[PDB]
Amino acid sequence: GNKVDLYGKAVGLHYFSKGNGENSYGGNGDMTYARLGFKGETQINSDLTGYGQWEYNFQGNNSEGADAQTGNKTRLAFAGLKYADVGSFDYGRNYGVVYDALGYTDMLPEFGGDTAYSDDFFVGRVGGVATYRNSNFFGLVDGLNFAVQYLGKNERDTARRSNGDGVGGSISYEYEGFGIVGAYGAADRTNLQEAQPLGNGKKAEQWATGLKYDANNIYLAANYGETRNATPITNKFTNTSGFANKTQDVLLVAQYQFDFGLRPSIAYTKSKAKDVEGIGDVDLVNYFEVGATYYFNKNMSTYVDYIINQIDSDNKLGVGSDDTVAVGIVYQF
Amino acid sequence: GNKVDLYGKAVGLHYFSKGNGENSYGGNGDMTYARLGFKGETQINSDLTGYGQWEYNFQGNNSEGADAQTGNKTRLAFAGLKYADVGSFDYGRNYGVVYDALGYTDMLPEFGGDTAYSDDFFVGRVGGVATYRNSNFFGLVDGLNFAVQYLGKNERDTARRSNGDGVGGSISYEYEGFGIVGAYGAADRTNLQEAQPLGNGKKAEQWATGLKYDANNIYLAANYGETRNATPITNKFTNTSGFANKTQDVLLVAQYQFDFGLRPSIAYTKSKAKDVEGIGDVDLVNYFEVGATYYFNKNMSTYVDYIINQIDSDNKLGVGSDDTVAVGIVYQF
Amino acid sequence: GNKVDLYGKAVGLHYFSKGNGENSYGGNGDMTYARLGFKGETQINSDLTGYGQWEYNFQGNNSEGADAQTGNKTRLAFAGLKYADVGSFDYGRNYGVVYDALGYTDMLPEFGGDTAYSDDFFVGRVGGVATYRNSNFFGLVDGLNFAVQYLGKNERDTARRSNGDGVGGSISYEYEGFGIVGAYGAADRTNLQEAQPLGNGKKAEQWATGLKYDANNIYLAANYGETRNATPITNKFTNTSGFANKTQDVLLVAQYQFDFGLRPSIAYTKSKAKDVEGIGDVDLVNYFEVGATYYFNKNMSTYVDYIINQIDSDNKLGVGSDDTVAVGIVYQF
Ligand SMILES: CC1(C)S[C@@H]2[C@H](NC(=O)[C@H](N)c3ccccc3)C(=O)N2[C@H]1C(=O)O
Numbered sequence A, B, C: 001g002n003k004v005d006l007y008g009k010a011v012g013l014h015y016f017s018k019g020n021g022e023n024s025y026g027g028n029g030d031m032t033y034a035r036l037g038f039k040g041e042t043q044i045n046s047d048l049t050g051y052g053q054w055e056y057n058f059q060g061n062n063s064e065g066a067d068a069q070t071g072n073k074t075r076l077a078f079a080g081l082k083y084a085d086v087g088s089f090d091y092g093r094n095y096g097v098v099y100d101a102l103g104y105t106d107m108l109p110e111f112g113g114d115t116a117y118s119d120d121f122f123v124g125r126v127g128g129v130a131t132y133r134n135s136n137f138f139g140l141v142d143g144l145n146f147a148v149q150y151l152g153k154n155e156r157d158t159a160r161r162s163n164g165d166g167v168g169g170s171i172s173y174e175y176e177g178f179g180i181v182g183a184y185g186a187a188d189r190t191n192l193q194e195a196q197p198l199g200n201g202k203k204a205e206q207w208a209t210g211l212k213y214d215a216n217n218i219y220l221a222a223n224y225g226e227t228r229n230a231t232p233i234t235n236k237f238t239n240t241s242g243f244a245n246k247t248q249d250v251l252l253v254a255q256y257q258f259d260f261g262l263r264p265s266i267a268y269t270k271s272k273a274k275d276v277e278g279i280g281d282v283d284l285v286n287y288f289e290v291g292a293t294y295y296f297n298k299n300m301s302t303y304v305d306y307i308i309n310q311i312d313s314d315n316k317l318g319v320g321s322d323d324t325v326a327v328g329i330v331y332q333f
């Protein structure tokens, strides 16, 4: 009783921003890529299932010369066990448990999910996490779920990609279309992170909440969160980098799914940093979004996504102000 | 109605050239590699199909240490739609539309296709191309086909791998075994390309024509083409590189397929550069080929390919003069 | 009649060593990874089969930034033919024929097989080998097998990963649970290897013998071997490296497979270098092992592996002394 899904996608994708667009939200140029992965589950007995998943990103916008590997990476690599109503346990490279909140609004055709950074403690995909998850409170309370996650230190060659040990968890409740969730995690920072000119403190923290409605072809969701010493930042001006002492982040999204296959989306996103050494208050992300995806079927879709960027040209970190539209065609299986 | 072919091959491959063979056509040593890819198509309705393909090259001739990734790359990554008799449109990393001509002679057991450079405008695989193709002139003229291709600028870290925007197209006609084709493309060069000591001008151009006969187990084909500011070149002597101001290229191939599985090949290829700054006229490629492939079945083959190199030892760019034989065994699926 | 097995695994894996553990046997931290590969065979006629295999290692313990490719590599890439009772021939990246002996004890849950180095002549996976193998002496003697292997020179950018040409072979005999094997190989060293401060001579050699019993849920095996100018070594102290002039290596392993799925293991391993320039005699590896693997089924397992390291703290090369325990969960297909 083993079942393995070999999956992936090819995505033709182009970003249009004015001129450079090194002063834009998303950049400009070919951004085509493919994904390949497997996910497997084995029925060990009537109450115990084992499972694993690996998922890799192949950029399609590099040449076949020296830059051939730019942006290629494993995204997910983990294995685990799931026992009857007791819960699941898995270990490896997986989603941070704060993403259990941030997923509510990470639903745009192309962009969105701006605060769910990779290799950033609990908010995105990260290496070396053991995660326990529970559905329906041990089978006792329909729609109530929770999880805890143990993050092992990863002392890497860059501050941006490092973390020390930490714990985080999430609780959510869903009932006939509605969902609420909260998530929090904290972890030590490493000395390389502490040595960064931007950001000061011994503990990174991240929390976020989410509300959503997800029924009758409607999707509305909001997330609000804060972080300390956790959101990574650069100042293009002095070329210094590190982490924002604080941030407050909101994301809203509303979307509708027509039966004939079109899926319009509108969204708002803002993330402001505070106490940034040498600057004070500064916006990191601030934009409105309109876009749509058109689904021909489960295997083929196309989409446009337009980012109406509200960052101004005088932003103190050198964050880009110009808009970006992305256009994509997706074959997947 | 989705169908995905997961495909690939393992290729044991060895090159024999005298001594180095840093002064040979193909080099010397282990050249083993594997390929993996998927190609999928989904029947969206009776007149519309979606499709995507990704294809990657894994070298098998690197160690497991620091050089482990040398020559690994995505070859193809694109997705598209094909509507009844109207045509197909796809975007991503795909073959240049000049390759629609150059494919006629790119048929040798191992070598050949010398002017179909990767990441070289329209002649080989390249990133960021939108390609439209038409079969049988909208369903109206059996055997008449055409295509146009829009190439977006790719300003990369090397001149050799860059291009500016351009358009190219191809028309071909096939009738009971015979085929003729022409293809042309032009594109801007980027300032990094223009700053190269070799090659001067604002526009790269490439064109090529092909004739072939391909029936009754016979395969005969010829290509003739020219290029301006498009064929990449190095002078080993001064270690300078860039692009040939002009070239003229011919390739011939003749082959026969025996029913018992052997496929002999003989071929001729010459590409001469002109107006090369500091040199004048110089051969880039000039060789005769004899070789064969033996097909045990659709999944297994073996081959030998011998390149009788006509480049002389006094060639002004430092192009190698010695011969090369390659031997290969191929399992594929 | 083609059959391709697409295979792989996801492995959540963590190493615990004290402090660093840069002075430990195995290190400390997340060591999660995945594997993907295919192996195919095609029935060409009733007596001839073609086959190929490729196998790749994706580390799951890197970030998605610049270090994303650390430790990723192709492990195997080869294709071949197998004719009735005559034998098999294959070429590409494959196991060294000395591994035909060293496999007997390379059976630990996580560690073990310490002398079977990658890209090290005949003892592990290596590029550019043509290998012939024979089963049951041409169909004439049940249980008697042999092989010869031709290794082509690989002059790489590092001494550690290079080899010159060489030949090696192996003979083994198996009868109702017992197995004996011997293997030997020799090859030239390259000038880059010869220029290393550690190791002196023109020929590398490696041999090893093995005994085992493998029936009735018991597994007991021993290997003894020697090497000249072949085992790679570093002195952390002066930061110099190269190859051990001589080594003598023993490995023992005993294991039992319970029907309910547990598989305890105990093992011993020691490898001592001799005539190391500037040092004399020095241990490379010296440890006891206890560990176990628990198999839920063919697709899921878990394991612990504890290495009781006997290298002392005064070891002259700077080889780590501290213990290491590894814990892993494995989903595979
Ligand atoms: C890989 C990321 C650039 S995506 C995420 C976030 N940004 C977005 O999500 C955003 N839609 C975006 C901006 C620019 C180009 C493309 C997409 C950011 O910064 N994180 C990075 C990370 O995870 O390391």
Ligand SMILES: CC1(C)S[C@@H]2[C@H](NC(=O)[C@H](N)c3ccccc3)C(=O)N2[C@H]1C(=O)O
Pocket (backbone or CB within 6 Å): B025, B026, B027, B110, B111, B112, B113, B114, B115, B116, B117, B118, B124
């Ligand atoms: C990858 C390429 C070396 S192959 C192509 C052309 N050369 C040949 O095709 C030729 N048969 C050949 C010569 C040497 C070794 C192996 C094969 C050339 O130059 N292009 C390069 C490119 O596309 O970047």
Ligand SMILES: CC1(C)S[C@@H]2[C@H](NC(=O)[C@H](N)c3ccccc3)C(=O)N2[C@H]1C(=O)O
Pocket (backbone or CB within 6 Å): C025, C026, C027, C110, C111, C112, C113, C114, C115, C116, C117, C118, C124
């Ligand atoms: C890839 C290797 C580190 S594994 C092999 C041998 N060591 C072991 O096998 C050992 N169990 C081990 C030690 C440390 C970490 C993990 C495992 C060694 O050294 N060879 C290297 C090679 O092949 O290049």
